[PDB]
Amino acid sequence: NNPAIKRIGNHITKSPEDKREYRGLELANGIKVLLISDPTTDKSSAALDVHIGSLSDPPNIAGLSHFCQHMLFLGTKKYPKENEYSQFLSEHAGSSNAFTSGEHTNYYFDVSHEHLEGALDRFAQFFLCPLFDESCKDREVNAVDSEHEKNVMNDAWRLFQLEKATGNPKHPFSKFGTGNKYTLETRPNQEGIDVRQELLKFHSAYYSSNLMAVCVLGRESLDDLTNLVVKLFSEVENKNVPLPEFPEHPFQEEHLKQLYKIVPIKDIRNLYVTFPIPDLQKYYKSNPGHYLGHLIGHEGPGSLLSELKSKGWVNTLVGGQKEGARGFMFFIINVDLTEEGLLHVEDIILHMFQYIQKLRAEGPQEWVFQECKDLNAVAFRFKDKERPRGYTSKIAGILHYYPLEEVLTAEYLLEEFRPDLIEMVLDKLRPENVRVAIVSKSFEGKTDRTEEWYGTQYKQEAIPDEVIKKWQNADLNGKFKLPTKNEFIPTNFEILPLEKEATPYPALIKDTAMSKLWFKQDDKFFLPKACLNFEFFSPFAYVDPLHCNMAYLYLELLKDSLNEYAYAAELAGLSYDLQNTIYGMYLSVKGYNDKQPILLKKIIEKMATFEIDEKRFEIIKEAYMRSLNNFRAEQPHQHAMYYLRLLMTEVAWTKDELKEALDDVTLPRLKAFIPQLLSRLHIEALLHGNITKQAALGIMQMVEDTLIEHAHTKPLLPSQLVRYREVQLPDRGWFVYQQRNEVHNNCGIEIYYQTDMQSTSENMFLELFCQIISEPCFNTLRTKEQLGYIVFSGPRRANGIQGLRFIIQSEKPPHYLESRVEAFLITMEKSIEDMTEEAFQKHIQALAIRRLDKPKKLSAECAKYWGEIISQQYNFDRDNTEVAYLKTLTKEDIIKFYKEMLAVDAPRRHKVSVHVLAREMDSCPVVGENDINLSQAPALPQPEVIQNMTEFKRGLPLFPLVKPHINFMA
């Protein structure tokens, strides 16, 4: 019947827990579509994935594909406004993003469910009639350049491009995909290329319906969704473009048995081992590559990491298959190196080949395959409901690899055991097909090459035949054994019935001097999972720099100790997070509830009776020191945020103070610290999930009793439960703190306009104002003025206080950046004065939907509750309360708020700026003094420059703490 539809797939296989409706189909023009109906979703979503990416970039214009991606958002013939798309999403509680990989360009958005069509319509035009406006092209070229600039000093990106540069230079795999001003503007200009036309050509050439996949999720019925999608996408032209292919591997003969010595930016020590392998994608029903990754990358008893770590050569390891593109893949085994490890690379690699030999000797094991198959089946059946935005994006991408009916199960459900495929891949992991790369500062000055796109310094040597020979003769090592049955595999999935006394929010069911227990039995997701969150309060975790280092070292030593045993629980879907905080310790255990008690008990017991291995202590301490120093390699904007934090918090140890005190922590010192840290404590926890009240009280008491029995822990005094305060800036004050980033050649800045203490009133004024300026901020500071790639605005919340912050990373100096933000602020004042009452009411509605958007899974709902507990505000009904209040604000209230707290002449303006200067910038003024279509920046007062943080805080008062919310019950 319907000529617009080539076919409607059969029933889409889903989990019996998934209440969403599904319908797959293929349009006449060849677009693969997956429709999703969720009548309860608050936000609708859509995504389109074109099966063409940077790998198809024309040789003479590197990055064109990524630039085409950016440009599609800047206007279409049907919707000309450069920001019609983003503005429409913003006003309807939506958002959007897009990415470019070697073979894909994925576009997606989410929006209030009531505006799916308006959003989908504007979105569809991207693939029908983009304008590629000449003025937008000239401006947007800077965003792309800015994007590359932040990556230039990033070790991961440098290594990513270096591998590409080190393969066959004729293979498209060697292309630079990001692109920058040089490749997108300069170069083409000095070669008479009209990028506008090149974008038009590329778009007209590859954006063919036959290479597109779409996924839409909304409240509408499947029939309504179908007509909707047929109506907006059946008009995309099918140009029958052949799907790009790359059968010849980028690493050929001359590229194997090669060794690379690389100089990193951060002080890191890594060893990368790569093997070229065939494309294994078509074998998704068996996944031979993952089978070997599961074994080679295994942690736990008898594993490769175990021996490497015992020999004190390695700390972490990653093994498995790495994607390439249609036609080729790689198999990697990457390890980090200890100092000793750096000097034993040859032995480390032999151990790898010894372990691989064991795999060949034992042969493929079906029980291992069965185990993963069972685990994956359980994971699929009980998979958490995804957020619409990420879900549609993911489906659109994988619709290109699997039949419509299997698009949900293909990546989870295993079906075939393939000892033949497994052996075939194992036969590619041999010394004569290996590539080895070492990353270490020790290579500084010894390199003879440079990677052109990032400037990476390295040396390339052939591996001597004898070394290859020694590896080829690897024999069985008695230390290497295959894993044993995974005893953490869950088997009990019953959902306890909802107790009669069940509450909508966490209830306080234990309030003792030793512990405060918040509890809630899951009443909406119904999966066999639970979240056990614990907060251990102790003044000694952050009393001084030395103890902060010990709190950290201790927990890091503990996790390194439990790793081998915890890995099994990990594969079985039971993980935990343990870290030190400025108030003590944080422990989180989540996953299938079945075996959580066992993992938890083990952690606490281990914690309270810990024995530190001296060798592990020196190694982890050396890494921690390196980690503290490496902060200098972080980006300018991250430095700005770090500084503001140190500046506004009553107590905070800098990274310089931490490493200085690090030489003082000795094994003896750490051993004394632990028992002292555990002697006096207070525990506040939230147990949320598939568990009863008595199981919860039981778990809480088991934790206390373990600590009491092994560490003689006693309660902490209530007045000892202290929370840090935020510095109170003076009315009409403006302070500036300036610093320099010595790695990145970009400037960073954070502007913080402190308002007042948090409260229903203060909160909504600030949030409404942020909702109204959000998209305009991006459109003004980035799209129009192109200050940088990183342009951010939003509320800042800390220690119960709040305010508006702006964060920008750019080539332009901080004082200039400041001027533009002040100019923008004026533009927003006028703008708000000029907007209609309905437009105002529209933003209120948008904010409301964002705040009332319901969590789709247990961990997300838990997180919201945990946030109320940690902040000690315990306002569980905050969203309904704050929204009800938000719907009462008038345009006048926001104008008053701005004129009183934000305007340059506001009586209560509390401003602080953090200026981070670029590497190649000696000095720079703190304040500075035409009309190139740029708004007029107001004149600024003279700022008081901060020389010493400690003095700065001493001469200022401290805000009080926010009062709790009354949540009564025994």
Partner: peptide, 11 residues
Amino acid sequence: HSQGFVQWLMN
């Protein structure tokens, strides 16, 4: 562990 780069439009 077992193995499991794109550029974006937006920070």
